[PDB]
Amino acid sequence: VMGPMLDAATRKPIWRHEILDADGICSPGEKVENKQVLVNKSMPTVTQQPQYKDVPITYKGATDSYIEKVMISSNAEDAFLIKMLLRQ
Amino acid sequence: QPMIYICGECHTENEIKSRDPIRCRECGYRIMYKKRTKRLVVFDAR
Amino acid sequence: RCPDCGSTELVEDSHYSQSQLVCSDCGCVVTEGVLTTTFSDEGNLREVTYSRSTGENEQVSRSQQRGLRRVRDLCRVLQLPPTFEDTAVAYYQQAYRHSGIRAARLQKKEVLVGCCVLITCRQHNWPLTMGAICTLLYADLDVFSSTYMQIVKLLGLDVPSLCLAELVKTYCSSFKLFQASPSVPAKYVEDKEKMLSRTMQLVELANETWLVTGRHPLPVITAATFLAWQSLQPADRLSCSLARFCKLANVDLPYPASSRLQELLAVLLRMAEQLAWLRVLRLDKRSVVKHIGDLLQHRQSLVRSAFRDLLLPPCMLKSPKRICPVPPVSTVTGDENISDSEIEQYLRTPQEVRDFQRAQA
Amino acid sequence: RAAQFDVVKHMRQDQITNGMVNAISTGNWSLKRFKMDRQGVTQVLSRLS
Amino acid sequence: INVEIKKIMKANEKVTSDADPMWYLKYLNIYVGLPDVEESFNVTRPVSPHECRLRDMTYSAPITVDIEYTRGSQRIIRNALPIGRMPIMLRSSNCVLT
Amino acid sequence: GPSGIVPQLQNIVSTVNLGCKLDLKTIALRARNAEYNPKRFAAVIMRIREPRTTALIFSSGKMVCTGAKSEEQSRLAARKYARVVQKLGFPAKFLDFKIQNMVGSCDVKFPIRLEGLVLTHQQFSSYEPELFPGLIYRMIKPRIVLLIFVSGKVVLTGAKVRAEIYEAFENIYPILKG
Ligand SMILES: [Zn+2]
Ligand SMILES: [Zn+2]
Known about the structure:
Chain C: GO terms for molecular function: RNA polymerase II general transcription initiation factor activity; RNA polymerase III type 3 promoter sequence-specific DNA binding; TBP-class protein binding; zinc ion binding. This is part of a larger assembly, with three copies of chain A, one copy of chain B (about 45 residues), one copy of chain C (about 350 residues) and one copy of chain F (about 180 residues). Chain B is mainly beta and about 45 residues long.
C-alpha cells in the first residue's frame, strides 16, 4: 500500500486520495464522499522487476459517511487485515 | 516522522513503518487502531 | 486518441451508474457500457488448475506422486502454514526436472525432500534445526548432508543463514522449568521474559566474542541458559550440575556443551578483570556466575577494552613461534633417471613370488 | 522397510479439524453411513436488535 | 462433550492388523481441553471470543488423547497426543465466559 | 601486496597412458609395493618413498599418480612407476602425461569473520558451520575452490599450475583483510 500521490502544481494530494493518511490508509474522523479511495492497494503482475497494477478499495455510496475507527491486525498466515467502520 | 498506532489493550503508542508483524511493543496483544486525524471538520448543528 | 480532436487526454470516468471513456478535452464519448458476471452464477463457480487445463499431472509417476504425498505429510506434521507446503511442492516439482534427480534411489529422494522443506522454511526465515528433521526422516545425517550439498550446488539457489536469535527464541520455550509441575521443584521456576532477556544478552556476548563462528550454536546456547539459570538464584542453583539441569529439563545435553561452557566462563573471567570491584574480589570459575548482571550491564566498553588486550581457537593460541614454515625447494627431477636400484627393490624374487602364490591359496 | 515403522509419524492433524469447521460453516452434513444428506442445518445469528 | 465422546472412544478403542499380526494400537483416555490460539512459533495463550470475532479466527479447543502401540517392543505409551481441535459453544462448560 | 607468506602446495595429481595391455594379477605378484584386492576393486595400488606418492595401475593401459609436492615431482614419480612397469616385463610407455589437480594452502595471520564473508559474498561463498566449520568459496578466475577458516588459514584446490594458486591468493587477500 503506497502513500497518496500528490499533484506537482498544488503540492497536495489529488482529489481521489483526499482522505488518505501518509501510510496510504484512510484516517478516522474524516468525511468520505462517493468515488474516493480508502486503501491504495496494488499487487504485482506475476499472477525483470515485477510491475504492480493498482486495485484500490474505492467507496461506493449514495450518501456521505464519516469514518469511525480503523483497525489493523494480522492472522497466523502473516496476512495483513484491515477493517474500517463507517457511520451515517 | 513515522505513523503511530494505539495498541488495542494497553493504549501504548507504537510505531511500525515496516513490514514487521503487528504485535504490541510492550504486551502480547495483536490489535492496533489508527489515531484520529489532525485536520478539522465542520458540522452543522441540525 | 479522441476521434474528434486527436488529442490524447482521454480520462476514464463514470456518471451516476454508467462506466464510460470520455475525451476530457472536448466532451466526447468514445466508449461506454460494460458486460460483467453476476452473483447468480458466482455460486456455481468452479476452478481448474492450469496444469489440469494444459495436460499435466497425468504423467506423474507412482513414485513421483508418492514423493509429493510424502512432501505434503512431512510438511503438515510440523504445523507449517500452507505457504510452506506449496513452496515445498513447487521446489520439488522443479527439482524433479533434473534427470539425475528423478533417476535415483528412494532414500536419496527422501533426504532431498528434507532439504527441500529446509530451504523453503529458511526462505521464510523460520529457525529449524537439522537434527530434528533428520530424525523425522528415515535416513542418516551423512547422506542427508551430502544430498543437501548436492542439490544446493546443482540449483545454485539462495540459502538463508540460520539466524541465532530466532533459534534461541524457539529453543527457550522447550524449557519446562517455567511451569510448577510436580516433577520439578518450585524453587527452579522462573519468569520467562527475563529468562529470554538474560539468555539473549549472553548469546549476543558469545556471538561478538567469537564463540559462535565455525562452531555449533546449540551448546553455546545451552551454556548461556545454564549460566543464566545459575546467576538468577546463586543461593541454590550454584550447586546444580549440567546433568542435573538437563535431567530437570528432560533435554539431552551435547557433549561439547561442557567445553563451550568452560570457554565462555574463561571469556567471562577475561571480562571481569577490568571492573574495579571484581578484579579486587579475586573471583573464580564458580563465583563469577553471581556477577553476570553487572558484567552485561556495561558490556560494550569492557569488551572493547578487552579486545585491545581478540579470541581465537585455543589450539592455535599456544604461542606458535613458527607459522606455515616454508618447505625446502625440492622441484628438481634430475636429468632422466636419478636412480635405478629402486626398481630392483620394488620387485619380488621367484621365492617370494611362489610364497605369495601359496599365501592366499 | 524390513525394520519396524511407527504410526506416530502419520497422525494427520488436519483431517478432524477441517471435517468439522467446514461442516458447521457450510451447513451441509453429508454422511456415507446413511447414504443421506441434510442441508441448511445452521444459520448466521441475526443481530438486528 | 463430557460423556458421549467417552462412549464413542470406548466403541473403537482397539485396532489390529491382519498383515503382520501381534502389532496393535489401543486408546486409553481422551480429553477436550480449553480454547486457545496457535501462535506463530508453536505456542498458545488463552483467547477470548471477541478477539476471535475481530481477527476472523475460529474459537476452538484442542482434542487430545493418550495412546498405546507397539514398535518391536510393546512398551511405547504417549499421554497427550493431539488428534484435532473442537469448536466451542459459548457459555458451555469449557468456555472462558462461564 | 604480499605479506611474505607464499602459498605452499601439499599435493599434486597427474596421469599418463601406458600404451599397452597389462595384467593386474601379474603386477601384484611380481612387484613388492603393489597392492591388489580384486574382491574390492579391479586396480593395483603402488607406493614409493622417493617421491612420496601413491599411484594405480589399470589393465586398460592407464596410470595415475598423486601425493607429490610439485608437478615436476609428480612427473618424476609417474616416470618411476613407468620404469617399474617396464622392467616387470610389460611393454609400457610414458605417453600423454597430464597434470590433473594440485592443492595448496596459505595463511594471513589475522582472524577472518566468516559471518562478514558470507553476508557480503553469499552469491559464491557458502557458509555452514554445522557440517563443516570452514567457509566454502568457489571462484571463476581461475577455476579454483577454497576453504577459509576462522584462524585465517586457507586451503586452495583445483589448480593446474602454481601460478594459479599464487594469483588466487593475491585475489582473495584484500577480501580476507577487508
Ligand atoms: Zn499492548
Ligand atoms: Zn475530443
